[PDB]
Design an enzyme around this catalytic site. Structure first.
Site, short mmCIF file in Angstrom:
data_model
loop_
_atom_site.label_atom_id
_atom_site.label_comp_id
_atom_site.label_asym_id
_atom_site.label_seq_id
_atom_site.Cartn_x
_atom_site.Cartn_y
_atom_site.Cartn_z
N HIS A 75 45.97 24.04 -12.90
CA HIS A 75 47.53 24.02 -12.76
C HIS A 75 48.29 24.92 -13.87
O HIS A 75 49.28 25.09 -13.62
CB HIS A 75 48.10 22.64 -12.42
N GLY A 155 52.14 19.84 -22.15
CA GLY A 155 51.63 21.20 -22.83
C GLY A 155 50.15 20.77 -23.39
O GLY A 155 49.53 21.76 -24.01
N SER A 157 47.54 19.50 -21.46
CA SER A 157 46.39 19.52 -20.39
C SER A 157 45.24 20.78 -20.70
O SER A 157 45.90 21.85 -21.41
CB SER A 157 46.87 19.88 -19.08
C1 LIG Z 1 48.23 24.33 -8.66
O1 LIG Z 1 47.09 23.76 -8.12
C2 LIG Z 1 46.68 22.35 -8.45
C3 LIG Z 1 45.42 21.59 -8.15
C4 LIG Z 1 44.93 20.27 -8.71
C5 LIG Z 1 46.04 19.61 -9.48
N1 LIG Z 1 45.95 18.24 -9.94
C6 LIG Z 1 46.81 17.43 -10.59
C7 LIG Z 1 46.36 16.04 -11.20
C8 LIG Z 1 48.03 18.17 -11.10
O2 LIG Z 1 49.12 17.15 -11.65
C9 LIG Z 1 50.24 18.22 -12.01
C10 LIG Z 1 50.02 18.56 -13.12
C11 LIG Z 1 49.82 17.59 -14.14
C12 LIG Z 1 50.26 17.66 -15.55
O3 LIG Z 1 51.41 17.74 -15.89
N2 LIG Z 1 49.31 17.62 -16.79
C13 LIG Z 1 50.05 17.48 -18.00
C14 LIG Z 1 50.40 18.70 -18.70
O4 LIG Z 1 50.76 18.76 -20.11
N3 LIG Z 1 50.47 19.90 -18.06
S1 LIG Z 1 50.90 21.13 -18.98
O5 LIG Z 1 50.00 21.79 -19.98
O6 LIG Z 1 52.44 20.83 -19.67
C15 LIG Z 1 51.47 22.62 -17.61
C16 LIG Z 1 52.01 22.27 -16.54
C17 LIG Z 1 50.11 23.66 -17.38
C18 LIG Z 1 51.49 23.98 -18.15
C19 LIG Z 1 48.99 16.52 -18.85
C20 LIG Z 1 50.51 16.15 -18.83
C21 LIG Z 1 51.58 15.94 -19.66
C22 LIG Z 1 52.51 15.27 -19.43
C23 LIG Z 1 53.05 14.61 -18.13
C24 LIG Z 1 54.40 15.23 -17.36
C25 LIG Z 1 54.85 14.74 -16.35
C26 LIG Z 1 53.72 14.91 -15.11
C27 LIG Z 1 53.10 13.67 -14.57
C28 LIG Z 1 51.95 13.94 -13.67
N4 LIG Z 1 51.18 12.95 -13.47
C29 LIG Z 1 50.24 12.76 -12.21
O7 LIG Z 1 50.15 13.49 -11.59
O8 LIG Z 1 49.48 11.62 -12.27
C30 LIG Z 1 48.57 11.34 -11.34
C31 LIG Z 1 47.96 9.94 -11.64
C32 LIG Z 1 47.42 12.30 -10.96
C33 LIG Z 1 49.39 11.23 -9.79
C34 LIG Z 1 51.05 15.07 -14.32
O9 LIG Z 1 50.31 14.96 -15.58
N5 LIG Z 1 50.70 16.61 -13.79
C35 LIG Z 1 51.12 16.81 -12.24
N6 LIG Z 1 48.39 19.43 -10.64
C36 LIG Z 1 47.34 20.04 -9.69
C37 LIG Z 1 47.71 21.48 -9.37
#
Ligand SMILES: COc1ccc2nc(C)c(O[C@@H]3C[C@H]4C(=O)N[C@]5(C(=O)NS(=O)(=O)C6(C)CC6)C[C@H]5/C=C\CCCCC[C@H](NC(=O)OC(C)(C)C)C(=O)N4C3)nc2c1
Ligand SMILES: [Zn+2]
Length: 198
Positions: A75, A155, A157
């Protein structure tokens, strides 16, 4: 057709320094040089360390070297190449079902060792070089000992969860939050990385 654009490369723009007694973020490339490097895919900067800070034109996140592979989240990176001294490098692993991608680890990086300790006392490393204690709660879940607003995890992940001995236990994937507070994290277990490697 003739005007269709190409997406740029992921670019390493810094690192989380874990070499000494204090963890701290370092920037190695500013926004302007990042945009240029993303377009050319040519990054001549020396790479060091296990945890890189990476950017596209629109997102910034982390990438972690384990077993000679630089791993991050789909993602963040999509199917993008990563910039390297000799040009764009194509992904070696891509798994959208796991939110996982990998490239060959850059020359000069150091790799974390996959954890075989079977310990549940973990540590999450963020893009701000915070080391957050996390209790493992399942195959892909861990709870923060001290919950934090999701703003503090955004940020990060692609960053590592580590065991007490500094081995890689997983890759931070998503935050579990209620009313904007991160009480737990979802992560890609290192065993899933090792299976992808087969
Ligand atoms: C496009 O194809 C795909 C394929 C598989 C996939 N599997 C996925 C599981 C998935 O999750 C989406 C992305 C992921 C995400 O924001 N992660 C980071 C991150 O820092 N990101 S990032 O560095 O800022 C960025 C945005 C890259 C620059 C660690 C977290 C930090 C803060 C949480 C912000 C609020 C969102 C809370 C979501 N909670 C969530 O979904 O909890 C569950 C329990 C799982 C429902 C969440 O954490 N989310 C949604 N998206 C995908 C997309
Ligand atoms: Zn271990």
């Amino acid at each position: 057709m003739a005007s269709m654009k190409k997406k740029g490369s992921v670019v390493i723009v810094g690192r989380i320094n874990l070499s000494g007694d204090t963890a701290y973020a370092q920037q190695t490339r500013g926004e302007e040089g990042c945009q240029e490097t993303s377009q050319t895919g040519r990054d001549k900067n020396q790479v060091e360390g296990e945890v890189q800070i990476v950017s596209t034109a629109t997102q910034t996140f982390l990438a972690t070297s384990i077993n000679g592979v630089l791993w991050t989240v789909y993602h963040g990176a999509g199917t993008r190449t990563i910039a390297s001294p000799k040009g764009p490098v194509t992904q070696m692993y891509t798994n959208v079902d796991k939110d996982l991608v990998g490239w060959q680890a850059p020359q000069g990086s150091r790799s974390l060792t996959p954890c075989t300790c079977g310990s549940s006392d973990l540590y999450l490393v963020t893009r701000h070089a915070d080391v957050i204690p996390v209790r493992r709660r399942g195959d892909s879940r861990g709870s923060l000992l001290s919950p934090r607003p999701i703003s503090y995890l955004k940020g990060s992940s692609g960053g590592p969860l580590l065991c007490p001995a500094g081995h890689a236990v997983g890759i931070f994937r998503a935050a579990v939050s209620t009313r904007g507070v991160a009480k737990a994290v979802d992560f890609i277990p290192v065993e899933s990385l090792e299976t992808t490697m087969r």
